[PDB]
Design a protein around this nucleic acid. Structure first.
Ligand SMILES: [Mg+2]
Ligand SMILES: [Mg+2]
Ligand SMILES: [Mg+2]
Ligand SMILES: [Mg+2]
Ligand SMILES: [Mg+2]
Ligand SMILES: [Mg+2]
Ligand SMILES: [Mg+2]
Ligand SMILES: [Mg+2]
Ligand SMILES: [Mg+2]
Ligand SMILES: [Mg+2]
Ligand SMILES: [Mg+2]
Ligand SMILES: [Mg+2]
Ligand SMILES: [Mg+2]
Lengths: 159, 196, 140, 55, 107, 184, 110
RNA sequence: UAUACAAUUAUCAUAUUAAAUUGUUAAGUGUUGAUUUAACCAAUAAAAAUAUAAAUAAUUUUUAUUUGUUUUUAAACACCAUUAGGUAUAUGCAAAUAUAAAAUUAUAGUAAUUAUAAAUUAUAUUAAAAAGGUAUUGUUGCCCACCAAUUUUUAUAAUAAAAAUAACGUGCAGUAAUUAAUAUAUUUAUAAAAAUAUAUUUUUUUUUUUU
């Protein structure tokens, strides 16, 4: 991804969650950027109690993942927009997604010298693995590899 | 001839020019000194100046190695003593000497085991003296100033990053919460020293 | 008597000292021995003489045609080293030479890293080991 | 797959969840605080709802 | 594939210099970049003074595009009076490079 | 005044002083709790405690915490002490390896001795001496022997000693677990 | 810095002495530095360097007739306007005004 | 009086090819009270965690730029003083050990030198074994400043500075030396010096390869 966010939010009535997410989204569109994926997660129990705008500590919070394509200039604006919203407890930001840690160290990349387009195409989920991932995806990966490489040109040279 | 080449009639044979100006060095290395004991600078064993050295600092922990007489010392029988203790604490109507027999068996063996370990360890002291120890002849490695050159190499690096300027300089320690107590326009985190 | 110690070193302390039956290397050893007795040479000097003595061209590459790790068999060494002490007049009673050279080796056989030696303590030097811990010594 | 540390098949959930290995409290529990200090030691007890029992 | 030639060098260094300048305008103390700006400015000075003896019109239009005339100004009267400002293009080896005949009839 | 939790004066008991934070149930310590142990049914908490404490002490965490939580020390003395610690460690490691490289030789000489016992008494005999059930007619004998081995292998809980904390006068080191003098 | 780090040559030991100074020598020179500094403090020294003036030549303000400590010695001759301004500087240096940066104070500064 | 440094490795003050700079997080109330300290006294107590890549090498920056002093306590710890407070850490100014040098002292005329490291010095819980000396038949050893006389040079700052010096009176600063020392910084003062902030051993060591 170009940018990503993890947004720890207060667990409110659904109409409010939807309004808040519409506000963040519109704040991203106005600033001339895109949303790769807005992923929803449940109301979880974190390891740290968060206080909201009421200064009332919270045991539970709704987690929400943002993945954005912006300019680095106007994500300052979106940053202090998101962090200043009352329904967001915490937001952590990943800017490292284009050059993550495991590449371009003493010619680790075979047949290319730092191809940037490898990790840009990808989403955050495949750059940073989630805990549930097991050896099983090693299977799926390749059925999604081989299959892809079969249909790509034929699909592209159609139009 | 009848004795060592490094030792003549009156004491250690004085090769370097330090020996001729300071010839107390030939005949006295300490209170563990005898005359046969010159040129062998280590003196007997259990004796003053008998300790072998490793990169210059003497080896005074030997028993602690084989786990005889140490706080971390190896214990032979545990399960036995615990078992027997349990027996004692449970009830007084039945008395089990079966446990005390397994235990005293265990101990009876332990004695010989220990004498064996001690003997093997003295053989280790001998071997360590022959094939490892420098006999207190090399500079200590075990305290940070001995490694000063190493640290220097690091200071140099942080200097070349700073345009080859501030040597031995470090960032000013700020405050417990310097970042959130300061207004816009003032440095909220400690900078590189050259950056001040 | 230190002679026996020296010879023990030439026998057991040297990987591949050529074929020790051959009259060439044999004469090297003979001469050096007679020079350790009668004090004409230091033990260290005579040892470094022995191992640096001239043997045969392309020595290592002929050694690849016999040895794997360059460790020869020690029989030729001991038979030569006893032979030299017998032919030189070293002992009044003939057997003693062979016995001592043999015995001192057998005792060292039990020691940890037996055939290696620290270079400083191996021979005569300013600082020495106590007479109990000396290497092929009678007092060990 | 041959070289992987990761189990392939259904994976036990108890080896994932954060709160699996952690305390499980009850409205009736008493929390005893034993604080050892250098020159002192003391003890207190608290209701689960946070109310102090004895001094 | 030209990089090392004078015009190119002068331009890229001109740009780098502007960037660092406005950067220092924002966040006042990083003296690392003060130093890097000064070094860049020096190498720019070299590049430009070699340019005017290679082709001067391009030199001119670079100065007019990026507004760097301030680093072409001779530093101080002392070293200027001794003709060590003009002595530079001697060391650079461009002193005789003119090829008159297109300009200035040599007769 | 406001003190940190590891401060000397931290939780005071006085007429003015009042403890800070939610102190029970879900509490001030919520995500700050370094260790948690579910007590196994019928296990005294003294084994639990001595296990925790042995752990902390052997990995030199209780060292660190005691050290830093009592006095301030400049980053130079902290560096000096930590790197001194680490270099003393390095030295003693290089001693241990020597000891071990010798003890593997000793162990070899032992195993060799065992071989000589083998060809004096024959292999099978030696195996007999070592507890080989050649006298086991039926499985019931086997299950007696293995029941013995089972009752040995089961590990009674180890009570591992934790060195006491020594309180000295002005406390040059509150890491003090022994009475030896130290270089500050 | 303006003042002198050291007084006299504090690193005199034999070549390759692996420290800047020995304990002995550094203690001697610490003594001499101590005496000089103590003299500066008790006599209440004040120096000044004024803009648009030769700098190496510093007006000694501690000898000025108003700020002079001695009741006897003839102090120094400095321009009337300049000396008034120096007196005002020394005076208004003394105390901390809030919003200004805290600067170290002493008895001997007055 | 004249009469031959080094240039392969030399510690106090003349820097120089360098990638940084910027991030709003945490923490707080139940109740009747001996916490901290070797010992005193004031008196709510909890707390402030994230960034790599990239920047090309050398030839005219030396009047330029640069080497831990920093608004806001209505926020604490810490430190300094003592029940009445001060202060509480890089927006002004501030070149400076990381070495270019010719016997010590001394503002570059004073005395005749100085500095220096491995000999020697009895008690640190191993199945008795590791240790320092400014002294030199060695702690009943040496030494340190102020406090008088005088001698001599001068760049005369409470009471000038410096050097020779053998009185009197305070002490006990130093030799790991009765709270280890050393350097810088700031404060303090009968006198050595002492308090605090940083670096550091020319101070003595105590040692978890996932428990
Ligand atoms: Mg000794
Ligand atoms: Mg207050
Ligand atoms: Mg001072
Ligand atoms: Mg210089
Ligand atoms: Mg302030
Ligand atoms: Mg005079
Ligand atoms: Mg005087
Ligand atoms: Mg004293
Ligand atoms: Mg002192
Ligand atoms: Mg002292
Ligand atoms: Mg000091
Ligand atoms: Mg005093
Ligand atoms: Mg001082």
């Amino acid at each position: 991804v170009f940018y990503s966010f993890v947004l720890v939010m207060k667990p409110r009535q659904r109409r409010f969650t939807s309004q808040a997410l519409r506000e963040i989204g519109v704040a991203v569109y106005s600033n001339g950027g895109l949303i790769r994926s807005i992923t929803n997660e449940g109301i979880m129990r974190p390891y740290s109690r968060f206080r909201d705008a009421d200064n009332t500590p919270l045991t539970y919070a709704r987690y929400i993942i943002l993945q954005l394509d912006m300019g680095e200039e106007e994500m300052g604006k979106v940053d202090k927009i998101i962090r200043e919203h009352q329904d967001v407890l915490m937001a952590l930001k990943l800017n490292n997604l284009e050059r993550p840690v495991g590449i371009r160290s003493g010619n680790k990349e075979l047949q290319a010298a730092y191809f940037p387009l490898d990790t840009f195409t990808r989403l955050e989920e495949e750059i940073n693995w989630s805990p549930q991932t097991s050896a099983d995806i090693y299977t799926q990966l390749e059925m999604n590899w081989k299959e892809f490489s079969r249909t790509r040109w034929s699909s592209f040279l159609r139009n | 001839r009848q004795h060592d080449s490094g030792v003549n009639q009156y004491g250690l044979k004085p090769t370097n020019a330090y020996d001729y100006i300071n010839p107390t060095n030939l005949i006295n290395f300490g209170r563990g000194t005898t005359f046969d004991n010159l040129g062998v600078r280590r003196a007997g064993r259990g004796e003053i100046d008998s300790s072998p050295s490793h990169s210059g600092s003497p080896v005074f922990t030997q028993a602690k190695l084989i786990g005889l007489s140490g706080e971390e010392q190896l214990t032979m029988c545990q399960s036995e003593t615990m078992a027997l203790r349990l027996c004692m604490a449970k009830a007084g109507k039945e008395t089990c000497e079966r446990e005390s027999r397994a235990l005293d068996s265990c101990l009876g063996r332990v004695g010989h085991l220990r004498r064996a370990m001690s003997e093997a360890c003295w053989e280790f002291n001998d071997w360590f003296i022959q094939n490892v120890s420098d006999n207190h002849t090399k500079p200590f490695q075990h305290r940070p100033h001995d490694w000063r050159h190493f640290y220097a190499q690091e200071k140099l690096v942080r200097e070349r990053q700073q345009n080859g300027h501030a040597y031995g300089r470090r960032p000013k320690q700020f405050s417990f919460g310097a970042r959130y107590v300061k207004t816009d326009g003032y440095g909220k985190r400690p900078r590189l020293p050259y950056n001040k | 008597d230190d002679m026996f110690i020296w010879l023990c070193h030439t026998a057991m302390s040297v990987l591949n000292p050529g074929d020790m039956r051959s009259r060439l290397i044999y004469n090297h050893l003979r001469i050096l021995a007679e020079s350790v007795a009668s004090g004409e040479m230091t033990q260290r000097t005579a040892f470094r003489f022995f191992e640096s003595a001239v043997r045969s061209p392309a020595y290592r590459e002929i050694a690849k045609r016999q040895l794997e790790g360059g460790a020869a068999t020690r029989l030729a060494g001991i038979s030569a080293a006893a032979d030299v002490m017998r032919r030189m007049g070293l002992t009044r009673r003939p057997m003693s030479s062979y016995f001592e050279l043999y015995q001192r080796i057998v005792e060292r056989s039990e020691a940890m890293t037996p055939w290696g030696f620290p270079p400083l303590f191996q021979f005569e030097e300013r600082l020495s080991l106590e007479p109990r811990l000396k290497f092929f010594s009678r007092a060990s | 797959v041959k070289n992987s540390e990761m189990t392939q098949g259904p994976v036990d959930y108890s080896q994932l969840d954060m709160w699996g290995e952690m305390p499980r409290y009850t409205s009736d529990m008493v929390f005893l605080y034993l604080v050892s200090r250098r020159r002192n030691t003391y003890a207190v007890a608290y209701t689960y709802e946070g109310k102090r029992i004895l001094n | 594939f030209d990089t090392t030639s004078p015009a190119v060098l002068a331009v890229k260094r001109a740009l780098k210099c502007r960037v660092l300048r406005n950067h220092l305008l924002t966040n006042p103390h990083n003296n690392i970049i003060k130093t890097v700006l000064a070094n860049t400015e020096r190498k720019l000075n070299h590049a430009l003074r070699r340019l005017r003896k290679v082709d001067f019109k391009k030199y001119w239009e670079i100065i007019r595009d990026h507004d760097v005339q301030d680093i072409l100004q001779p530093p101080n009267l002392v070293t200027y009076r001794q003709g060590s400002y003009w002595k530079y293009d001697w060391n650079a080896g461009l002193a005789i490079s003119t090829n008159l005949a297109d300009v200035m009839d040599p007769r | 005044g406001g003190y940190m939790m590891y401060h000397r004066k931290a939780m005071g008991t006085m007429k003015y002083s009042k403890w800070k934070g939610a102190h029970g149930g879900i509490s001030h310590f919520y995500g700050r709790t370094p260790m948690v142990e579910e007590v196994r049914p019928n296990e005294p908490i003294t084994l639990v405690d001595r296990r925790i404490m042995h752990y902390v002490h052997h990995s030199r965490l209780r060292h660190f915490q005691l050290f830093r939580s009592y006095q301030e020390k400049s980053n130079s003395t902290e560096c000096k002490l930590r790197e001194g610690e680490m270099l003393r460690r390095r030295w003693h490691r290089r001693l241990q390896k020597s000891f071990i490289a010798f003890m593997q030789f000793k162990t070899m000489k032992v195993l060799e001795d065992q071989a000589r016992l083998v060809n004096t008494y024959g292999q099978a005999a030696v195996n007999a001496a070592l507890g080989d059930p050649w006298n086991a007619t039926d499985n019931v004998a086997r299950e007696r022997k293995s029941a013995a081995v089972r009752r040995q292998v089961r590990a009674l809980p180890m009570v591992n000693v934790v060195p006491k904390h020594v309180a000295t006068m002005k406390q040059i080191h509150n890491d003090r677990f022994n009475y030896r003098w130290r270089v500050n | 810095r303006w003042a002198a780090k050291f007084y006299g040559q504090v690193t005199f030991g034999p070549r390759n002495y692996p420290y800047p100074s020995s304990r002995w020598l550094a203690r001697r020179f610490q003594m001499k530095k101590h005496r000089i500094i103590k003299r500066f403090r008790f006599r209440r020294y004040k120096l000044a360097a004024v803009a648009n003036l030769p700098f190496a030549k510093m007006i000694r303000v501690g000898m000025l007739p108003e700020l002079k400590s001695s009741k006897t010695k003839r102090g120094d001759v400095v321009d009337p306007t300049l000396s008034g301004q120096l007196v005002s500087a020394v005076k208004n240096t003394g105390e901390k005004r809030k919003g200004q940066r805290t600067r170290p104070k002493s008895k001997y500064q007055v």
